[PDB]
Amino acid sequence: GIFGAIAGFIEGGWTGMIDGWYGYHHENSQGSGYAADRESTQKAIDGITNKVNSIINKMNTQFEAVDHEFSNLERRIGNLNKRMEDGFLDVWTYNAELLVLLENERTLDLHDANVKNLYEKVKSQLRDNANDLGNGCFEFWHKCDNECMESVKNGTYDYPKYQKESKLNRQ
Amino acid sequence: GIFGAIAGFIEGGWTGMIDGWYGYHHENSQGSGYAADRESTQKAIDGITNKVNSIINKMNTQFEAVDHEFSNLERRIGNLNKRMEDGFLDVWTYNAELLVLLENERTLDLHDANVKNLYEKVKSQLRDNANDLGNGCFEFWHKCDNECMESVKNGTYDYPKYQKESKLNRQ
Amino acid sequence: GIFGAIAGFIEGGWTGMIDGWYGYHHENSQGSGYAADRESTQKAIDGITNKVNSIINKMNTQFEAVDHEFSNLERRIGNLNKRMEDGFLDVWTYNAELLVLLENERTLDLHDANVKNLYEKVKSQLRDNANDLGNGCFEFWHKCDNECMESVKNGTYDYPKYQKESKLNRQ
Amino acid sequence: DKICIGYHANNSTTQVDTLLEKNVTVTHSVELLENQKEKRFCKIMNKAPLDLKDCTIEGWILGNPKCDLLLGDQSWSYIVERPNAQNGICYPGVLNELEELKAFIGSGERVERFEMFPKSTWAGVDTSRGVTNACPSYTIDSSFYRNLVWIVKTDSATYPVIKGTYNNTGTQPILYFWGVHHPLDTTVQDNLYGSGDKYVRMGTESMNFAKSPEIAARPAVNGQRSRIDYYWSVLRPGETLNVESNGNLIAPWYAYKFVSTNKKGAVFKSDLPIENCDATCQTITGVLRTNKTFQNVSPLWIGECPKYVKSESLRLATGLRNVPQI
Amino acid sequence: DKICIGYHANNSTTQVDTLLEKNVTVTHSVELLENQKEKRFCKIMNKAPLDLKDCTIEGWILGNPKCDLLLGDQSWSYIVERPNAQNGICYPGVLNELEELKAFIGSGERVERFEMFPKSTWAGVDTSRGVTNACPSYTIDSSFYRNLVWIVKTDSATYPVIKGTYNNTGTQPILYFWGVHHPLDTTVQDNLYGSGDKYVRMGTESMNFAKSPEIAARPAVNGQRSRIDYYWSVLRPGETLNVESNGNLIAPWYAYKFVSTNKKGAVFKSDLPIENCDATCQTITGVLRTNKTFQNVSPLWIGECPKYVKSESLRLATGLRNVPQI
Amino acid sequence: DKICIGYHANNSTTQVDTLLEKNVTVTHSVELLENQKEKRFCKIMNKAPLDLKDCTIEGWILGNPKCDLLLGDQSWSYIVERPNAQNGICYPGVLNELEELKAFIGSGERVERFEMFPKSTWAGVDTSRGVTNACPSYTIDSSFYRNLVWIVKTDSATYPVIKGTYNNTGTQPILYFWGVHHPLDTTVQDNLYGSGDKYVRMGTESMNFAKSPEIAARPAVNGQRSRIDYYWSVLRPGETLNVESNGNLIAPWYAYKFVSTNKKGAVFKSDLPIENCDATCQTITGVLRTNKTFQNVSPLWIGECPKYVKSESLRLATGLRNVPQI
Ligand SMILES: *[C@@H]1O[C@H](CO)[C@@H](O[C@@H]2O[C@H](CO)[C@@H](O[C@@H]3O[C@H](CO[C@H]4O[C@H](CO)[C@@H](O)[C@H](O)[C@@H]4O)[C@@H](O)[C@H](O[C@H]4O[C@H](CO)[C@@H](O)[C@H](O)[C@@H]4O)[C@@H]3O)[C@H](O)[C@H]2NC(C)=O)[C@H](O[C@H]2O[C@@H](C)[C@@H](O)[C@@H](O)[C@@H]2O)[C@H]1NC(C)=O
Ligand SMILES: *[C@@H]1O[C@H](CO)[C@@H](O[C@@H]2O[C@H](CO)[C@@H](O[C@@H]3O[C@H](CO[C@H]4O[C@H](CO)[C@@H](O)[C@H](O)[C@@H]4O)[C@@H](O)[C@H](O[C@H]4O[C@H](CO)[C@@H](O)[C@H](O)[C@@H]4O)[C@@H]3O)[C@H](O)[C@H]2NC(C)=O)[C@H](O[C@H]2O[C@@H](C)[C@@H](O)[C@@H](O)[C@@H]2O)[C@H]1NC(C)=O
Ligand SMILES: *[C@@H]1O[C@H](CO)[C@@H](O[C@@H]2O[C@H](CO)[C@@H](O[C@@H]3O[C@H](CO[C@H]4O[C@H](CO)[C@@H](O)[C@H](O)[C@@H]4O)[C@@H](O)[C@H](O[C@H]4O[C@H](CO)[C@@H](O)[C@H](O)[C@@H]4O)[C@@H]3O)[C@H](O)[C@H]2NC(C)=O)[C@H](O[C@H]2O[C@@H](C)[C@@H](O)[C@@H](O)[C@@H]2O)[C@H]1NC(C)=O
Ligand SMILES: *[C@@H]1O[C@H](CO)[C@@H](O)[C@H](O)[C@H]1NC(C)=O
Ligand SMILES: *[C@@H]1O[C@H](CO)[C@@H](O)[C@H](O)[C@H]1NC(C)=O
Ligand SMILES: *[C@@H]1O[C@H](CO)[C@@H](O)[C@H](O)[C@H]1NC(C)=O
Ligand SMILES: *[C@@H]1O[C@H](CO)[C@@H](O)[C@H](O)[C@H]1NC(C)=O
Ligand SMILES: *[C@@H]1O[C@H](CO)[C@@H](O)[C@H](O)[C@H]1NC(C)=O
Ligand SMILES: *[C@@H]1O[C@H](CO)[C@@H](O)[C@H](O)[C@H]1NC(C)=O
Ligand SMILES: *[C@@H]1O[C@H](CO)[C@@H](O)[C@H](O)[C@H]1NC(C)=O
Ligand SMILES: *[C@@H]1O[C@H](CO)[C@@H](O)[C@H](O)[C@H]1NC(C)=O
Ligand SMILES: *[C@@H]1O[C@H](CO)[C@@H](O)[C@H](O)[C@H]1NC(C)=O
Ligand SMILES: *[C@@H]1O[C@H](CO)[C@@H](O)[C@H](O)[C@H]1NC(C)=O
Ligand SMILES: *[C@@H]1O[C@H](CO)[C@@H](O)[C@H](O)[C@H]1NC(C)=O
Ligand SMILES: *[C@@H]1O[C@H](CO)[C@@H](O)[C@H](O)[C@H]1NC(C)=O
């Protein structure tokens, strides 16, 4: 992948996380579970939905072929009509098929980037209070309960609060 | 954002920085100020200008509808001309509107990436001689005067020069 | 560049590395040499080849102008045919030239990202057992022979194996 | 204690193509192209189509004696013509500007049949013997078009200059037909219209017509070596038609007040069945009931239809690359 | 001591749309589409258009007596025809191949009127009484086209075979007109052209023409139940025209040396005023003064105009997402 | 001990353009557009083209006496007509529906010449003196079209009603020609066809034709002030043609069984040489031997050709930005 996360340094997806495109898996004394990052998932849903709707809107005109007939002495204008209708058919077939291939590539990259950025967002908060395993997982140098976990997920993790404990366990 | 900088880990823009798209805000004993990164800004200006000019150049042909009339016994070729002219109208309307939406998305991503890369470029020079606050700001572990600041901005920051002092203050 | 690697923090390319798009240059007691990363290079070759073939496939229809003649009293349908043929000519000329400019930009970005991701992939394995020089080069804090080098290149570098030695030399 | 960042996976086997890679399995996607049709014709805006059955367009508006089922007023959302329809022009000859006529008729939604020239119109001639074995009805071996009158001489007298006039005082255009008869030899010519140069001349504020019989023996068609030149025109609101002839006139009898549709016009040549159904999109090869953006069924349709393309599938990725573990 | 990396913000409220998001405010952007016009006609390449005023194209080049303001030489960058122009074909009848004529005239930039056949040309006939109350001038109740001559008999003698020839020895094509008169009855026919079969025959190296009068009473138009069939043609450089008739000839009198434009041709049907102004782009609905790439004003124009699209706005982002603080 | 990450560089100076930057040197790229041609004509599917040489299309299928080299059966992959070909219509006049004829002929791949009406067909008239100094052969000063017969009277008798019939019992359509002669004066008319009203009438199951001579003196072309109206038609399989005339008939003599090509049809007007070569793509301006996707040579071609565009170059980057050190 272009951003290296999906099928990258995070080798696979989670069938266990069913409520979102992007999220977390935590482990502590209270056990383990999956949680979707609601913000990044919803933002992506809105964007992709906007993209699909935009494509649909731009494709919402139709070239219309006619049932008009042409006599034996109208081969030229008859062939003119055929080449015209076939012409626009080829143009729109091209436009649709090329757009789909292009947007599919970019859509997948978008998801890849969102995962990458979500990872970065956690790495930034945790700093050296956790150990980066290189697979998108962080091992805390301190005890991180359910509310500590949730603070990481909602971007309000308190690094100074666990700094001294982490340092001691790290060193 | 795709690269996570603009409206990302750098939450907002600087109305105070008026002379460039991308830059710096420094604080030291001599005070504080905004400075545009001239290199990255100019590179982006040249690219975006090239993009706009390229789009204009590719759009620089015109389909031309005609004022030709058709009699009551020329309904078929009359309707042929109408469908043709409307046909190209729809094609070009599609081409223009779709291109604009696509390029607008990519243009904004380009700016996002340039900010991200500018941030990375500073992080790379400073290393552990500074503290990354996670918002695009770095707090030096040493005294960094105007020429030290400028060396960071022009890519010639001397890490060994401030290494021992930084280490002492850091530890 | 958008991903900052090619003509970025890695200032230039290697004429010495002839067998791949992306790779490594190592230095140890056994000397120095270039080695292409086969996986990332082949993946890129397959993608770019798919892109070229896809573009060719979508462009594999032809509008066909005709040699039909029109009398002096057929100026209207004569001009209709001319405007139609010129119309599709302009559409396809636009489609081809615009697509090429767009895909060239994205192709170059793809290569840039692949280099960036390859760099990240090495940085992730080495951690603090090596020193990042900021130019895509890593100086080991330990002796890294040919099989150590190859383990880095094939993603199986053993960080714990060299951890204690590296720490001692680093500290 | 651990926290991991990750992405959705599911049991999807649905794939998409990209510029870089074919066959990429994604967690979520949407198909934009419709390839399914109901192989039948339905109503459009709750308006039924007109089935021409065994009659062609020509047989219908000329009033072919075997097309009485269609005879009179008709309203339609579109026209269905059956490919092997047998009842068209029964008495051999050419209907002039046929393609333009079909295009004109196609652009309409309703015709109202009325008597434009009663047989009383033509003075000094016979309006009772205009029949032929080439044009039988379902009960009679020799009949003629319900909208035309084949005029011949009284038993022995000469064919006089007959005249007719019609002033369109209505608000709607009038589609009407007439003809010129061309006997195979001068014998039949004399037997029916007498001697001397014959003419058929008709005119309005914007149209002039003038034709004379062209006597010649042509190959036998429906047992006839003679021919009729059929013509059509449209009498605009406020216009007046004058008919003048001294022989060989197939006179206009019944005509049609014509209602042009504001919408798009269609004439489908098909064997598909018209059933008791509604639809918003009617393709020549069937009904499309879909909300999809594209279709590969047919470029020929009436109503609100998806864009026609040659593609087999146009599937947009919406979700991400599906990489389920294990 | 701190250094921060950041990006530009300003007071922009100008927004753009992307595939991913609508209404994105950006620091800098450019509008590519022009929607403003000057509702008027101007000169193109400092060449003035030709205002036909109260005359239609037909009235102009036929030489309708009420079109003397236009009579003679004309140069134009394009033609403006007013929608309610009253002075066209005054004596009722059809100008044949009218649409092709308009297309031909549109492809020109200059005509030079000259006398092609002086009335001296037609021997043994009257060239002085060809007038009609259907074609009055501004001072006279009965006149005729300045470019045609309605020829009738001398008071009592028969209509002889008249002949005329013209050899185009110039370098420019010649646009010329002629006609055939169709009386309502044989009485008027005899009164004007005498008795016997009448013909109008004309020919060049590449054209043949042959027509005979078609006598019939058609609905009254401008107080006339008779008609004239008007015709036009183009005498190529080096070609010769021969005119031969024994009656019913509306003869060519004045014609036009025709200069075809190398550029694009336009005929605008509009009520807009022609003012004393210059322009590079002239739309049928007004002048565009812009450097923008697109326009949604009209697909019909002459000169160097932006591409026509249906879009309301085509704004390209150039700057970045505007996120001003606070 | 060091390891570095890096990318390929080479000695490429080949550049591409992007939306963001012009002239970017890349390590690898592919040109999609072909601009090279072999300035000649070759065979298509190992089938040779038909060189019309000094004869135009008209001269060829009419059977101009100087076109005997072409006379008879022909098979072709396409037709080459030389721009300054001199042998077309020798006896002045118009070949009607010429453009449709050229389009029809272009849609074919083979004609088989046969005798459709032997001179024995026309009874009571002379089929031996139909020649003219306007139509010389290479050995004779006065000849005529090999496919037509100019019929005149026996030395003193009148021109009788002549008749001819042909029943197309074959499986292929038949392209045939005929004509009507128009003398410059009644003297020549009487001298050749006698006195009285003359007609030419022809008919099939789907075609009617009727023409009378139109006598007038037209400008001299090839020493002739008279003209011939040439006509053409296609006798469908199973159709029958009846010819009937009492004068002024240029009768059909030889005709062509016509084989319509399933493929695309082409007629190239060019001076380029036909050589002994094969090709898959034949442009009007030369042969394209390429596997490229686009070409800027010409939009006019036959065979499997690349898409035509106006572009000078369409080079896709495949490799990366070339930044060789030092
Ligand atoms: C990100 O997610 C975290 C959760 O993981 C959340 O932070 C917590 O917010 C809750 C708010 O409900 C805090 O709970 C309060 O608890 C105190 C007393 O709790 C004591 O024990 C905890 C145990 O660790 C100690 O750490 C604390 O220091 C406390 O001494 C309680 O008084 C307080 O207010 C009322 O609670 C009763 C129930 O409603 C009520 O009846 C009573 O009258 C009290 O007035 C809260 O219940 C919890 O302590 C926070 N976590 C930590 C570690 O401190 C973040 O939520 C923030 O959101 C904003 C809007 C604020 O309004 C607060 O809710 C949080 O700062 C969340 N962030 C975001 C952005 O969503
Ligand atoms: C990135 O930005 C930094 C500035 O922040 C710049 O580095 C500085 O470059 C200037 C060049 O003008 C250096 O100034 C010289 O100063 C010495 C004496 O200054 C002493 O005091 C400083 C105070 O910190 C000490 O650090 C030094 O060690 C010195 O002992 C002076 O002799 C010298 O040359 C002349 O100066 C007089 C004025 O022109 C002249 O009359 C006299 O005859 C001298 O010949 C300079 O004036 C400054 O010291 C640099 N900063 C540091 C920390 O050392 C980078 O500029 C580089 O650009 C290239 C082209 C070189 O030519 C030098 O200009 C710099 O190395 C700048 N980099 C880029 C890429 O733009
Ligand atoms: C990434 O690249 C590295 C190489 O840089 C590779 O790791 C090496 O794999 C080879 C496999 O051939 C290992 O060689 C074995 O050597 C032992 C004895 O060697 C001893 O000396 C080394 C010197 O450093 C010590 O480090 C070891 O601990 C050993 O004590 C040998 O017994 C063994 O098996 C046979 O070898 C003979 C030759 O075939 C055979 O005749 C005999 O009967 C033995 O059965 C291997 O020859 C080498 O030790 C590895 N490197 C290190 C540092 O340990 C990675 O290859 C892996 O690939 C998978 C498929 C496994 O099957 C192994 O090949 C490796 O784990 C490579 N990774 C990838 C993904 O490509
Ligand atoms: C798994 O099977 C199919 C998709 O392959 C579909 O029914 C659904 O996504 C899954 N089934 C259930 C019962 O959830
Ligand atoms: C991949 O594409 C191939 C076409 O060759 C076909 O087997 C199928 O569409 C795909 N394979 C799957 C879905 O397993
Ligand atoms: C047609 O009828 C109307 C009746 O309102 C009359 O005013 C008009 O003059 C008539 N036109 C002709 C040509 O008779
Ligand atoms: C559109 O049609 C699809 C059929 O696959 C259906 O799943 C979807 O719900 C429909 N959407 C709406 C808005 O009706
Ligand atoms: C702020 O207002 C508008 C833009 O909203 C414009 O005049 C300019 O950008 C600003 N005004 C000044 C005086 O700078
Ligand atoms: C956002 O779009 C809406 C259209 O519904 C309209 O209010 C306006 O264009 C935008 N809103 C702004 C600019 O506040
Ligand atoms: C026309 O005039 C030119 C005068 O140069 C003459 O050469 C030519 O023969 C004339 N043509 C006819 C048909 O009279
Ligand atoms: C193009 O027109 C715009 C009008 O908005 C103007 O601001 C700009 O300066 C013009 N550019 C040139 C090169 O004249
Ligand atoms: C270097 O020169 C050209 C490319 O500029 C080409 O022959 C090849 O890439 C190189 N030459 C050799 C001998 O490798
Ligand atoms: C860059 O483009 C310019 C066009 O102005 C031309 O010199 C050439 O194509 C390029 N320059 C090179 C390849 O050195
Ligand atoms: C034409 O010839 C066939 C011979 O099989 C015959 O059946 C048919 O009746 C003929 N048609 C005419 C019109 O003579
Ligand atoms: C296509 O043509 C190019 C000519 O530049 C050639 O290098 C290449 O090998 C050809 N490819 C095939 C598959 O023949």
Numbering used by the authors:
A (entry chain B), B (entry chain B), C (entry chain B): 1 to 171
D (entry chain A), E (entry chain A), F (entry chain A): 1 to 326
Paper text:
We used the pentasaccharide, α(2,6)-linked lactoseries tetrasaccharide c (LSTc), for X-ray crystallographic study of H6 HAs with human-like receptors. In contrast, TW H6 HA-LSTc has clear density for the first three sugar rings of LSTc. In addition, GD H6 HA has two hydrogen bonds with the main-chain nitrogen atom of S137 and one hydrogen bond with the side chain of E190, while TW H6 HA has one hydrogen bond with the main-chain nitrogen atom and one with the side-chain amine of N137, and one with the side-chain hydroxyl group of S228. In contrast, the side chain of N137 in TW H6 HA contributes a hydrogen bond with LSTc Sia-1. In TW H6 HA, the combination of N137, V190 and S228 results in a similarly positioned Sia-1 moiety of LSTc, thus likely alleviating the unfavorable interaction between Q226 and LSTc in cis conformation and resulting in substantially enhanced binding to human-like receptors. LSTc in GD or TW H6 HA deviates from each other at Gal-2: LSTc Gal-2 in GD H6 HA pointing towards the 130-loop and 220-loop, while LSTc in TW H6 HA exiting the receptor-binding site from the C-terminus of the 190-helix. Different from GD H6 HA, the combination of N137, V190 and S228 in TW H6 HA leads to a higher-sitting position of LSTa and LSTc within the receptor-binding site. This higher-sitting position alleviates the discriminating effect of HA1 226 for avian or human-like receptors. Thus LSTa and LSTc bind similarly in the receptor-binding site of TW H6 HA. This explains why TW H6 HA, with the hydrophilic residue Q226, interacts with human-like receptors in a similar way as pandemic H2 and H3 and transmissible H5 HAs that possess the hydrophobic residue L226.
